[PDB]
Every structure is written in C-alpha cells, then in structure tokens.
C-alpha cells in the first residue's frame, strides 16, 4: 500500500504549537519587531490576556524561541 501512503505524508502540516505549563493550551507565535540582532526572530508565549499576578486565568510565563 505504498503509493497511497506516499502522498498522505505530504498532507501533514508543521507540528502544533507547544502548550504552556500554566494552562496547557496552545501558545501563540509572536515576532520581534525591535530592529537589531533579534529582528524578525520568532517565539512562543502563553495566549491568555494579561492580568493580575493573583489571576490564574491571566497569561503565564511560557517562553520558547522558535528554531
Ligand atoms: Zn498559559
């Protein structure tokens, strides 16, 4: 069943975003716009809105450079 198999592979998109530890939910991909050595680099961070340090629903501290 090789042939049908071969094209199934090509339909497989990039792996999902990592999940944050605070909520176990897909992070979101932001792009650095600060011109400099990092300009254009991308990273993942928690997707929750910002909020009070006492708020479990607020954004958590996940950070991961996209390689
Ligand atoms: Zn989070």
Swiss-Prot record:
Transmembrane segments: none annotated. Changing residue 34 to E: Impaired binding to ssDNA. Impaired nucleolytic activity in the absence of pcna, but only reduced nucleolytic activity in presence of pcna. Changing residue 30 to E: Impaired binding to ssDNA. Impaired nucleolytic activity in the absence of pcna, but only reduced nucleolytic activity in presence of pcna. Changing residue 34 to A: Impaired binding to ssDNA. Impaired nucleolytic activity in the absence of pcna, but only reduced nucleolytic activity in presence of pcna. Signal peptide: none annotated. It is found in: Nucleus; Chromosome; Cytoplasm; Mitochondrion. Zn(2+) binds at residues 20, 23, 46, 60. Coiled coil: none annotated. Changing residue 30 to A: Impaired binding to ssDNA. Impaired nucleolytic activity in the absence of pcna. Expressed in eggs (at protein level). It comes from the Eukaryota. Belongs to the DNA repair enzymes AP/ExoA family. Interacts (via PIP box and GRF-type Zinc finger domain) with pcna; the interaction is required for 3 -5 SSB end resection, assembly of a checkpoint protein complex to SSB sites, and SSB signaling. Interacts with chek1. Functions as a weak apurinic/apyrimidinic (AP) endodeoxyribonuclease in the DNA base excision repair (BER) pathway of DNA lesions induced by oxidative and alkylating agents. Initiates repair of AP sites in DNA by catalyzing hydrolytic incision of the phosphodiester backbone immediately adjacent to the damage, generating a single-strand break with 5'-deoxyribose phosphate and 3'-hydroxyl ends. Exhibits 3'-5' exonuclease activity on a 3' DNA substrate; nuclease activity is stimulated by interaction with pcna. The PCNA interacting protein (PIP) box mediates interaction with pcna and recruitment of pcna to DNA single-strand breaks. The GRF-type Zinc-finger domain binds single-stranded DNA (ssDNA) with high affinity and regulates the 3'-5' exonuclease activity. Required for the 3'-5' end resection of oxidative DNA damage and activation of the atr-chek1 DNA damage response pathway following oxidative stress. This is DNA-(apurinic or apyrimidinic site) endonuclease 2. It comes from Xenopus laevis. The lineage of its organism: Eukaryota, Metazoa, Chordata, Craniata, Vertebrata. The chain holds residues 446 to 510 of 517 of the full protein.
